[PDB]
């Protein structure tokens, strides 16, 4: 048994676990050190054209430490500027993978209620970032999935559930609670008091399997779209960080090496080993992360990883350039009077092209976790985009525009103008939200004892649109 066998009062606040587990708590907090904001729309402005009409065209940054997850959810322009609990663009589901308060609220309101309403609904309740309670039972400290959609997805794909899995499988599945592709399923229900309500429920599209092509077939069968493209009017699918799904295609996943083997390696003390809880870049500490299994030099292994990154970059830039041109050429054909019927096959190719290429790139470690699948997916996506473009030349010709040259989108600014994103406006609106309602959320949470101000130290120094200078 543990020293807390009856459970932990205030379990959602990770600081409550420190009295039992100071070493894990200390390493866990050090994800504070990974504070860099890499603006992916600035680095890869093609992505802005790809996501025209969708919030990712406003703000999309690379992942940083878990310490920043909740605050980054609040800061992103994607969550907009609510004025109260009933406003703002996005739903409650946007908290789900950000906070140990999520399982707390599900365990209290129920899953459907939690998934009902606006993101802003829970601003003064969901206030702790990725914590011990997201991954551990507060009585036994055993690894646990705390979200019901993971087992749902596992079963649908023919996998064992979390409870049915081996320990080594659990050492990846805990991460898969969050590090997976998902969509929101509109779900009608009726509450305790008989009121009809609509939830938007996190759902893993895994019932045909976890390959990119199986998920594409799933989404096509249910005629699903995440949005209608703001330029080409294609019914689009958004990939989100399919980290676990791609990791399963790759040699390490095939061999049985878990997420935790590289990202939470064991550290040394006799009978008292412990797991490094500073989840970050395994290349920072290769002796702990790789050199237990590898006999090459660290430098040769790092050079190999760099090569993989460069291969992915090469194919990523080609795919998204053709995807971007295809969207723009479709928009031009629409301007000239091309019909939906004339554009249907083209739009199908664009949807598929971008689904495949986004699934390849949306997991930021996939270029390493599953290099060969990433390259094959980028190649396949590019081919779909080029099939669209070949068909588009003939549509453009039909309407007298065979010599049309799609505009360039080589800077974020130029791309956002094509996507009709008024950043200035969104940022100004966001700042006013942060200055008012967000501060009310934090004050109320602290007053109620849901939030410890210690957790906020340096948490809000940077976003893609400000930098006070260090997190």
Which residues 257-316 are close enough to bind ligand HEM by CB under 6 A?
257, 259-264, 274-275, 277, 279-283, 289-290, 292-294, 296, 301, 304-305
Q: Which region among 193-201, 340-348, 385-393, 409-417 touches a copy of itself (by CB under 8 A)?
A: 385-393
Tokens representing residue 386 in the block: 């080029």
Tokens representing residue 452 in the block: 């410890």
Q: In the complex, what is the shortest distance from the CB of residue 208 to ligand HEM, in angstroms, rounded to a whole number?
A: 19
The site string for a copy of itself over 389-428 (x = CB under 8 A, - otherwise) reads: xx--xx--x----xx-------------------------
* Helix residue ranges per DSSP H, 222-297: 243-247, 251-255, 259-263, 286-289
DSSP class per residue in 400-458: T-TT--PPP--SHHHHHHHTT--HHHHHHHHHHHIIIIIHHHHHHHHHHTS--GGGGTT
Per partner kind, with CB cut-offs from 5 to 8 A, the member of Y ion, ligand HEM, Ca ion, none near residue 183 is Ca ion
Per partner kind, with CB cut-offs from 5 to 8 A, the member of a copy of itself, Y ion, ligand HEM, none near residue 280 is ligand HEM
Which residues between 24 and 63 bind a copy of itself (CB under 8 A)? none
**Chain-centre distance of CA 33, in angstroms?**
20
Strands 196-203 and 272-275: unpaired
Per partner kind, with CB cut-offs from 5 to 8 A, the member of a copy of itself, ligand HEM, Ca ion, none near residue 430 is none
CB closer to ligand HEM out of 140 and 228: 140
- The site for Ca ion, by CB under 5 A, has a size of 3
Which residues between 192 and 251 bind Ca ion (CB under 5 A)? 238, 240
Q: In the complex, what is the shortest distance from the CB of residue 282 to ligand HEM, in angstroms, rounded to a whole number?
A: 4
Per partner kind, with CB cut-offs from 5 to 8 A, the member of Ca ion, ligand HEM, a copy of itself, none near residue 397 is a copy of itself
Does residue number 371 form part of the binding site for a copy of itself (CB under 8 A)? yes
- Say what the alpha-carbon torsion angle 423, 428, 431, 433 is, to the nearest 10 degrees: -100
Tell which residue, 76, 55, 33, 129, has the closest CA to residue 463: 76
The site string for a copy of itself over 268-307 (x = CB under 8 A, - otherwise) reads: ----------------------------x---x---x--x
Does residue number 311 form part of the binding site for a copy of itself (CB under 8 A)? yes
Q: Would you call 177 exposed, middle or buried from its count of C-beta atoms within 10 A (0-12, 13-18, 19+)?
A: buried
Radius of gyration, CA atoms only, the chain: 23
CB closer to Y ion out of 70 and 437: 70
Q: In the complex, what is the shortest distance from the CB of residue 249 to ligand HEM, in angstroms, rounded to a whole number?
A: 11
CB closer to ligand HEM out of 72 and 124: 72
Q: How far is CA 175 from CA 45, 135, 147, 342, in A?
A: 29, 8, 11, 44
CB closer to ligand HEM out of 35 and 342: 35
Q: H-helix or E-strand containing 190?
A: strand 183-190
Tell which residue, 140, 215, 196, has the closest CA to residue 170: 140
Q: In the complex, what is the shortest distance from the CB of residue 19 to Y ion, in angstroms, rounded to a whole number?
A: 6
Angle between helices 148-156 and 167-176 (to 10 degrees): 110
Which residues between 11 and 70 bind ligand HEM (CB under 6 A)? 14, 17, 21, 24-25, 28, 34, 60-66, 68-69
Give the Cα separation of 32 and 149 in Å (integer).
Answer: 29
Q: How far is CA 280 from CA 62, 88, 442, 445, 452, in A?
A: 13, 31, 27, 28, 24
Which residues between 345 and 364 bind ligand HEM (CB under 6 A)? 364
Please list, in sequence order, all residues whose beta carbon lies within 8 angstroms of the beta carbon of residue 369, skipping any fewer than 6 positions away: 243, 246, 247, 250, 252, 253, 363
Does residue number 432 form part of the binding site for a copy of itself (CB under 8 A)? no
Q: Which residues contribute to the site for Y ion (CB under 5 A)?
A: 16, 62-63, 287
Q: Which residues contribute to the site for Ca ion (CB under 5 A)?
A: 183, 238, 240
């Amino acid at each position: 048994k543990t020293a807390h066998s009856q459970g932990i009062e205030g379990k959602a606040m990770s600081e409550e676990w420190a009295r039992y587990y100071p070493r894990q708590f200390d390493s866990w907090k050090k994800t504070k050190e990974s504070d860099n904001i890499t603006d992916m729309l600035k680095e890869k402005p093609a992505l802005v054209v790809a996501w025209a009409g969708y919030p990712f065209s406003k703000d999309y940054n690379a992942p940083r430490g878990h310490y920043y997850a909740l605050q980054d959810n609040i800061n992103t322009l994607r969550t907009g500027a609510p004025v109260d609990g009933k406003t703002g663009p996005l739903p409650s589901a946007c908290w789900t993978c950000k906070s140990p308060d999520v399982p707390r609220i599900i365990e209290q309101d129920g899953e459907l209620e939690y998934f009902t309403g606006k993101w802003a609904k829970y601003g003064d309740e969901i206030v702790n970032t990725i914590g011990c309670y997201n991954c551990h039972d507060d009585k036994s400290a055993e690894l646990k999935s705390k979200v019901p959609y993971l087992d749902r997805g596992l079963s649908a794909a023919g996998f064992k559930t979390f409870a049915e899995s081996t320990h080594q499988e659990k050492r990846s599945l805990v991460c898969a609670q969050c590090h997976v592709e998902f969509y929101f399923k509109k779900t009608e229900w009726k509450d305790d008091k008989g009121v009809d309500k609509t939830a938007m429920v996190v759902t893993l599209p895994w019932s045909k399997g976890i390959s990119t092509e199986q998920m594409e077939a799933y989404y096509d069968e249910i005629n699903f779209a995440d949005w209608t493209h703001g330029i080409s009017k294609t019914p689009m699918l958004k990939a989100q960080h399919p980290d676990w799904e791609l990791y399963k295609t790759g040699i390490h996943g095939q061999k049985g090496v878990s997420c935790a083997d590289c990202h939470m390696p064991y550290t040394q003390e006799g009978a008292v080993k412990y797991s490094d809880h500073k989840v970050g870049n395994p290349l920072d500490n290769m002796d702990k992360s790789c050199m237990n299994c590898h006999r090459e030099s660290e430098q040769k292994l790092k050079d190999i990883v760099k090569q993989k990154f460069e291969r992915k970059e090469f194919l990523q830039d080609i795919a998204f350039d053709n995807i971007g041109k295809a969207h723009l050429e479709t928009g031009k054909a629409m301007e000239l009077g091309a019909t939906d019927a004339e554009l249907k096959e083209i739009r199908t190719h664009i949807r598929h092209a971008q689904w495949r290429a986004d699934m390849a790139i949306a997991g930021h470690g996939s270029f390493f976790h599953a290099p060969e699948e990433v390259l094959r997916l980028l190649a396949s996506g590019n081919e779909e985009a080029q099939k669209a473009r070949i068909k588009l030349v003939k549509v453009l010709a039909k309407y007298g525009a065979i010599d049309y040259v799609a505009p360039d989108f080589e800077t974020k600014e130029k791309a956002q103008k094509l996507a009709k994103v008024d950043m200035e406006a969104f940022i100004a609106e966001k700042l006013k939200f942060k200055q008012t309602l967000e501060q009310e959320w934090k004050k109320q949470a602290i007053a109620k004892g849901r939030l410890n101000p210690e957790s906020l130290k340096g948490v809000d120094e940077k976003s893609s649109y400000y930098d006070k200078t260090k997190k």
